[PDB]
């Protein structure tokens, strides 16, 4: 029918299960499923993503056992709330992305079975805390080729989705595909608590247990002599003449902030007796 920009709200559990399931899916490109809710055409929130067992033949739709689904989701029937399987995912866990043939194996199968049927491409490599490395698309019919493929009613998100200058094989396969927007929805109760448990765990010291104070200053006066003489030897050879030559080699000597922050640490940790004591 008519087309309007589809939005993938993700559950953050889905983000965790993708990273974990592809992390365990070490090179061997695992398959799993997507289990969600039909809200409309132009959005989808996924609420649950669980695991599918490893098959060593070939990443296929024929490895999807439907009675495995029946039994697993049967256990999940009274457990919380079940919904429709709305898709699937495969993995390319070392390199970024491309539009696989596994897509054109199972995508026609799950667009026969389900309606939205979103393909999902994943990688864990490109960062550890600050990127969106997963990728997702959807197969286009051949029958819409009479229509020119340029309507879109809200072109901010296609002005944000075309905007990253799509990389290699996606627009190697612009045909048989059309892209889809994946934001991270409002997950603030988890966001604040992982912020807490990141600068409370993933940065050392559980704050009762920081207040190294002295042997670090033995090593730091080693620093504040060894760094110092090299801070001395160099700017003797600055432009002490009247030359108009303009070609620098750049080394940016300065060494200030090490001294500064380390010795603020040294003074306020020498404070620890008069601070924690009385």
């Amino acid at each position: 029918a008519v087309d309007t920009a589809e939005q993938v709200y993700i559950s953050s559990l889905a983000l965790l299960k993708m990273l974990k399931h592809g992390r365990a899916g070490v090179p061997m490109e695992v398959m799993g499923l997507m289990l969600g809710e039909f809200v409309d055409d132009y959005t989808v929130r996924v609420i649950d993503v669980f695991a599918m067992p490893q098959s060593g033949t070939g990443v296929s739709v024929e490895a999807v056992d439907p009675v495995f689904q029946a039994k697993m989701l049967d256990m999940l029937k009274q457990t919380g709330r079940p919904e429709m399987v709305v898709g699937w995912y495969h993995s390319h866990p070392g390199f970024g992305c491309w539009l696989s043939g596994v897509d054109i194996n199972t995508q026609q199968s799950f667009e026969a079975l389900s309606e939205r049927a979103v393909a999902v491409v994943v990688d864990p490599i490109q960062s550890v805390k600050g990127k969106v490395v997963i990728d997702a698309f959807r197969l286009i019919n051949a029958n819409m080729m009479v229509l020119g493929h340029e309507p879109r009613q809200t072109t901010s998100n296609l002005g944000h989705l075309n905007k990253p200058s799509i990389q290699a094989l996606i627009h190697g396969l612009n045909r048989h595909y059309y892209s889809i927007t994946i934001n991270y929805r409002k997950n603030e109760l988890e966001q604040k608590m992982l912020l807490n448990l990141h600068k409370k765990s993933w940065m050392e010291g559980l704050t009762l247990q920081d207040y190294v104070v002295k042997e670090m200053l033995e090593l730091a006066k080693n620093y504040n002599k060894a760094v110092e003489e090299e801070d001395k030897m160099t700017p003797e050879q600055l432009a002490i003449k009247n030359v108009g030559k303009q070609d620098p080699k750049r080394h940016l000597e300065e060494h200030v902030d090490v001294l500064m922050t380390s010795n603020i640490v040294q003074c306020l940790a020498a404070m620890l007796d008069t601070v924690v004591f009385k």
Partner: protein, 93 residues
């Protein structure tokens, strides 16, 4: 004894210990070898030095030590932590 006297005399040892003035060195060195206290005694003047020890309760249900040291220390480091905050008021900025 209500400490801040830990390096001390010997006649209270030779009085409460029902021992003599001479036999306090056997006393302290054998008591260090036992293992209930581990402080090396200032032996030149028979001056005691002590460490970790095993308690038998304080004032009748631990009123006085608990209050005047524990809560006094509570408001000490608590209020001077508020003073740390007071001078460190906007150094977080």
């Amino acid at each position: 004894r209500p400490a801040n006297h830990r390096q001390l005399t010997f006649e209270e040892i030779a009085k409460s210990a029902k021992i003599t003035v001479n036999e306090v060195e056997l006393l302290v060195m054998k008591a260090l070898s036992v293992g209930l206290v581990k402080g090396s005694i200032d032996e030149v003047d028979k001056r005691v030095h002590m460490t970790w020890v095993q308690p038998r309760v304080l004032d009748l249900q631990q009123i006085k030590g608990m209050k005047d040291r524990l809560e006094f220390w509570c408001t000490d480091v608590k209020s001077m932590e508020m003073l740390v905050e007071h001078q460190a008021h906007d150094i977080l900025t």
